[PDB]
């Protein structure tokens, strides 16, 4: 099963992207909402990516059912930094940071490739974390940073009735897609350099602070 | 209800904050008029900031019966000021220890992010605080170091009549206000935090910084 090895394969780097300085002084209320919203415009440079990405390998007929539009954050972020920002000229200021710019640099890799297994990894590491984490990030935001509920459109699966549901269901997708040892093999080793990438963007947000 | 857990919720940073050597050393007698005068200044800048943040959010329209106007102190204080240095001075003299630049930090953007239970949170611990521990204050620093009444207009709030009845219905508005759960969460955590900011402008103080 794919789910179970991507999970196992990737432990030690999602262990350490997710204890980040950055994301734990985050959840534990130590800074505040402006590292929030840098967090989230870094997302939206690299959640713009991912999308273009995504939509490559989609209209490619490549993993159709796992690659939902649904989950597309872009423009859900996009309206979240609006109301975060007060007005909607934050999209001239916001550059990537160092490990952002390297993110997306893959990103754009494979979505010119049309990468179909190291955009499902890719795919893996930010949705299914976003489904699985969100709301415990969205519960932190508020409790600490006084975050309003609608500036949360990120953590928020519109017509996803049932996240629980939708979780087992995108394992089980996932351990049905139909891939070589090759692409399998391409695929695990793409979803831990997600992970570190993941863990970058953090060291970055966290830098100086 | 909420006033019965905000002063559980926020007692063990309560307790500390009330226990800083500077305090114990100034309300006792072991300090005189120039540490009292420090701490009025330093006051005098949370205030001003405090202030601003509290106009913001009764704009807003959020706990509009708590934020009574009446409350006010950066004004008053600024006279008590000028008759504790012998002129206008101060204002060009005076500047933020590091304790009052982050507590100034977070008022600031409790303002911008007008988050309403934020403001309450520290609303409730200067207010209720000057209400009843100034009261104390006021009448020792006349006792211990000859301090004028006058210079302590600060502790005496023209517009209350009845202190007690005061404190009995701020709480019962507490009791009152309504606040989702993340609301609620966010006014508790916010409230220890200003317990704690305030506990390090009296290391500042102690400390000369």
């Given amino acids: 099963g794919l789910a179970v090895e991507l999970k196992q394969s990737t432990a030690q780097a999602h262990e350490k992207a997710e204890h980040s300085t950055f994301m734990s002084d985050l959840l534990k209320g ?7 919203t840098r967090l989230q415009e870094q997302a939206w440079l690299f959640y713009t990516a991912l999308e273009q990405a995504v939509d490559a390998v989609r209209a490619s007929g ?3 059912s796992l690659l939902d539009p649904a989950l597309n954050r872009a423009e859900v972020l996009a309206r979240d930094l609006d109301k ?12 990537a940071s160092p490990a952002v710019i390297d993110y997306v640099n893959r990103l754009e890799e494979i979505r010119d490739n049309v990468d179909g297994p190291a955009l499902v990894a890719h795919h893996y590491v930010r949705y299914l974390g976003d489904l699985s984490g969100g709301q415990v990030i969205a519960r932190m935001m508020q409790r600490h940073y006084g975050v309003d509920p609608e500036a949360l459109g990120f953590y928020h699966f519109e017509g996803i009735a049932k996240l629980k549901v939708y979780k087992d269901e995108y394992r089980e997708k996932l351990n049905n897609l139909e891939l070589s040892d090759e692409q399998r093999e391409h695929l695990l080793k793409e979803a831990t350099d997600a992970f570190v990438f993941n ?11």
Same sequence: chains 1, 2.
Avoid: C, M, P, Y
């Fill in 30 to 36: 130590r800074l505040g909402v402006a590292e929030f």
């Fill in 62 to 64: 490549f993993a159709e």
């Fill in 84 to 95: 975060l920002n007060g007005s909607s000229e934050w999209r001239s200021r916001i550059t």
């Fill in 199 to 209: 863990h970058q963007v953090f060291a970055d947000l966290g830098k100086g602070l």
